[PDB]
RNA sequence: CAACGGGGCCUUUC
């Protein structure tokens, strides 16, 4: 069954991305999808994208514009601190100057940078790059 | 899909997008729960009561016509069954199941499909159980099973 | 079906089971269905006919036998006839035959 | 393709779509107001019916259940909903 | 007048509210059933861009749909006895906080009394003569969302004049920006 | 003065 409703939406973004698509619909778009999408449209991995109100749990349509690698998501969210941060970031992503591992804390989905200026961790999510 | 099975049916229900009730229904909500009301003294199960309703009037849902649902209807009137409709279902069939593997006792077939039934009605019970639709101490017994359905 | 009218009667109108009430509604005239088990003893089905046919009352005859038709009455207890004194909102008394 | 309007699919492209499989799903079924040879109702009839559904004031077969849509007894006025 | 319709503590708008509605029930011996338990609380004047103004009438919701089935023929009324409106008619739903985790337990916040169940019953007083049959919400890049109402073609001819009003009205309200759209 | 982070008030809400 699904259990990752964010990974089957980071899945076809991923699928769309590679093909060559320049939009993507994924279902059944929940709230943490929405704010892993935030998270990507603000660093510029994506462009618009659209929550059909269906009132099933919905849909989401996701306009790519061809700058995003890999988007992909961290399953079991392990529980990171400060320190695995960095560990976390060394492990997934392709350089130390680009490329966002994202967190879930109780102050919010938002990248690893953002966790590390703010001084919160919790537990990892996923990563775009 | 299909829990004891391979298939991967998809065909259900579309149910609208419209949660209000359409435009050309001009019966009186009060009057569909009359009906349920009058469906369910006939004995008629929340599922075969949807049926006619949707099908001899034009109650496209009691829920969004009412507002509530049909089983909740019939709670709220005091004829809610003694077991929940697809469990009596369950172990009605497994009823059946059993009474032909008695006469026959060579359907190995019916024996297997007579465990998944059970299996099913297991754990049908066990949600219900948990949440105290039936008693804590409610159990299906094979012995008993037409006894519990009639 | 005939055990779901059967049911409808026991949940929601009167009834009477066994020989002895059976009798005593059906000379009381107060019996508008009997049902006879199967295997039923043919002495007592031919008389529960003879009092249905002094007193006008309709007789089913159930497939099944006394554990049958207990089962479809809803007891745990063998019932060799059965006596319907009201339908209550069930249909067996009009749709027979 | 590589580029195409998902959030605004032509009609045709939805109503060739299964139901379940459209931006939005939606049921393709329908109510019919079927005209009894007697009057005082005009019955409302599921399209895809399973009861054979027979008049209020009358005794006659409207509608009769199949496979998919119901048939409607060969004399029928319907009007659909 | 001011004491069966007013519901509140007395503004001075108000007066021709239950005014125009006391003397179109005494108008209306076929419609002086229906006016009469309708009262209403405070209404709010919300500016429109086209130099108009909105008239929001709360209604908590005690025979909203006593308003609704009458609501199509006294709004071009209210409009017409003092134009440069547009006259909208509200439920007046609570809105119970989402607790905190350390808050003190209160009884289950039913679904009807949450922001988001009360925004959506809001767009549907405002569009309520047509039936809403669909909604979007764009997440543009620059951060901020736009949610879009797809309004059934049916009737629109009666709040189509009033779509900038509406989403005046609803910007005031909720903070929200929104756009309408009727999907030909 | 720009970014980055914090706190308090309304906005139907402490
Ligand atoms: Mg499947
Ligand atoms: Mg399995």
Redesign the pocket.
């Given at each position: 069954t699904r259990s990752s409703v964010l990974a089957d939406a980071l899945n076809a973004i991923n699928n769309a991305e590679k093909t060559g698509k320049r939009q993507v619909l994924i279902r059944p778009s929940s709230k943490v999808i929405i704010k892993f999408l935030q998270v990507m449209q603000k660093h510029g991995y994506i462009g618009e994208f659209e929550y059909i109100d269906d009132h099933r749990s919905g849909k989401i349509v996701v306009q790519l514009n061809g700058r995003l690698n890999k988007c992909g998501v961290i399953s079991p969210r392990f529980n990171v601190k400060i320190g695995d941060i960095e560990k976390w970031t060394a492990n997934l992503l392709p350089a130390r100057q680009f490329g966002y591992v994202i967190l879930t804390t109780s102050?919010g989905i938002?990248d690893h940078?953002?966790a590390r200026?703010?001084?919160?961790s919790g537990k990892i999510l996923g990563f775009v790059y | 899909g299909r829990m004891h099975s391979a298939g991967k049916g998809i065909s259900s229900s579309a149910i609208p997008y419209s949660r209000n009730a359409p435009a050309w229904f001009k019966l009186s909500s009060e009057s569909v729960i009359e009906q349920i009301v009058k469906y369910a003294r006939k004995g008629l199960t929340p599922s075969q009561i949807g049926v006619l309703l949707r099908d001899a009037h034009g109650v496209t849902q009691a829920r969004v016509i009412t507002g509530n649902k049909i089983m909740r209807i019939l709670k709220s009137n005091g004829l809610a069954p003694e077991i929940p409709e697809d469990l009596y279902y369950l172990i009605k069939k497994a009823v059946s199941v059993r009474k032909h593997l008695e006469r026959n006792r060579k359907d190995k077939d019916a024996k297997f499909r007579l465990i998944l039934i059970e299996s099913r009605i297991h754990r049908l019970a066990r949600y219900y159980r948990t949440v105290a639709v039936l008693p804590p101490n409610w159990k299906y017994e094979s012995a008993t099973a037409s006894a519990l359905v009639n | 079906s005939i055990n779901q009218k059967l049911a409808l009667v026991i949940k929601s109108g009167k009834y009477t089971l066994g020989y002895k009430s059976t009798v005593k509604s059906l000379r009381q005239g107060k019996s508008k269905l009997i049902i006879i088990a199967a295997n039923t003893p043919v002495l007592r089905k031919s008389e529960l006919e003879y009092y249905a046919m002094l007193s006008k009352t309709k007789v089913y005859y159930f497939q099944g036998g006394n554990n049958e038709l207990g089962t479809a009455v809803g007891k745990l207890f063998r019932v060799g006839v059965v006596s319907i004194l009201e339908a209550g909102d069930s249909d067996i008394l009009t749709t027979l035959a | 393709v590589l580029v195409q309007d998902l959030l605004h699919p032509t009609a045709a492209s939805e109503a060739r779509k299964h139901k379940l499989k459209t931006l939005v799903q939606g049921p393709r079924s329908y109510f019919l107001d079927v005209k009894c040879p007697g009057c005082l109702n005009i019955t409302t009839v599921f399209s895809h019916a399973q009861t054979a559904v027979t008049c209020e004031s009358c005794s006659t077969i409207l509608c009769t259940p199949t496979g998919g849509k119901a048939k409607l007894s060969e004399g029928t006025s319907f009007r659909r909903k | 007048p001011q004491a069966k319709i007013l519901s509140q503590a007395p503004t001075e708008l108000e007066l021709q509210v239950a005014q125009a509605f006391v003397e179109l029930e005494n108008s209306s011996p076929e419609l002086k059933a229906e006016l009469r338990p309708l009262q209403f609380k405070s209404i709010r004047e919300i500016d429109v861009a086209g130099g108009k103004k909105a008239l929001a009438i709360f209604v908590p919701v005690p025979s909203l749909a006593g308003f609704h089935k009458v609501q199509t023929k006294l709004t071009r009324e209210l409009e017409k006895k003092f134009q440069d409106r547009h006259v909208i008619f509200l439920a007046?739903?609570?809105?119970?906080?989402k607790p905190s985790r350390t808050?003190r337990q209160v009884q289950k916040r039913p679904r009807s009394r949450t922001?988001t169940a009360?925004?959506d019953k809001?767009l549907e007083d405002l569009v309520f003569p047509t039936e809403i049959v669909g909604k979007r919400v764009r997440y543009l890049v620059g951060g901020n969302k736009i949610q879009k109402v797809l309004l059934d073609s049916k009737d629109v001819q009666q709040i189509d004049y009033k779509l900038e009003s509406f989403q005046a009205v609803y910007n005031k309200?909720?903070?929200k920006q929104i756009v309408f759209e009727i999907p030909s």
């Open positions: 102050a938002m940078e953002e200026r703010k001084h919160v | - | - | - | 007046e739903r609570r809105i119970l906080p808050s922001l009360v925004h809001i309200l909720t903070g």
